[PDB]
Amino acid sequence: SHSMRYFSAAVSRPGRGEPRFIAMGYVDDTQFVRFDSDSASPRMEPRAPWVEQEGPEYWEEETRNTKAHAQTDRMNLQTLRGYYNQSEASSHTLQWMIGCDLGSDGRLIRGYERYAYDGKDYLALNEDLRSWTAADTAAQISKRKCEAANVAEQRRAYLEGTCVEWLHRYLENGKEMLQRADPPKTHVTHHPVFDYEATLRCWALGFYPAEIILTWQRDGEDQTQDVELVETRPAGDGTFQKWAAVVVPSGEEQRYTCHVQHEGLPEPLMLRWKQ
């Protein structure tokens, strides 16, 4: 199961110049395209090896469309400021998210386009790709515009067409890096807090993709009430890592096991502290 997404963010800075526009593209963690308005020469610059093999016409049209997105989102910042009757000295943020999800077979199962204003959902495209969902009375106006122009047809055409086709193309040009499955290297650590209590920590390092399941079990029974579980953080080299700790009494620490499930595993793993 894969996907391809494009994000954007427009942040206004009054008295500090024109609002900043940034745009990025990912395949399912992997940034391969970046645009920054504060760069020296704003262009759609590559961020992955399997995309640099595209010709200059690709980057030329990408930069053209991205510049159009920047100016359009700046006019959107001014427009939404008019909807909400806001001051001209306040900084505001406008975020955008488009993408398409490909199932196990390779055909579209989900596609979406979403807009947020100041960290709050503003305008969403429903799953039927033919209707909109507005969050407030000011978003109803943008909804009526999208219904008047019937842009859901062009949006559905991109999500069902270009998005899926170029997702396949990106997956084939980057098969060695994107369709890989690195299993996590696992080990369990021990940390006393004081006498009669200890902390068992189950580690999973250097795996891909990001999704993983770490579970602690007391005598083969899940313990998901008293477990610390950090959110999956990136290592910095394209891999991910995660740990899960539980507090156990001193002596009963052999009754605890770490059941770790990952895609790259040939089968689920079960760990126990070794000292």
Partner: peptide
Amino acid sequence: RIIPRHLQL
């Protein structure tokens, strides 16, 4: 490949 047109809110 990014979508050509942005929405006008």
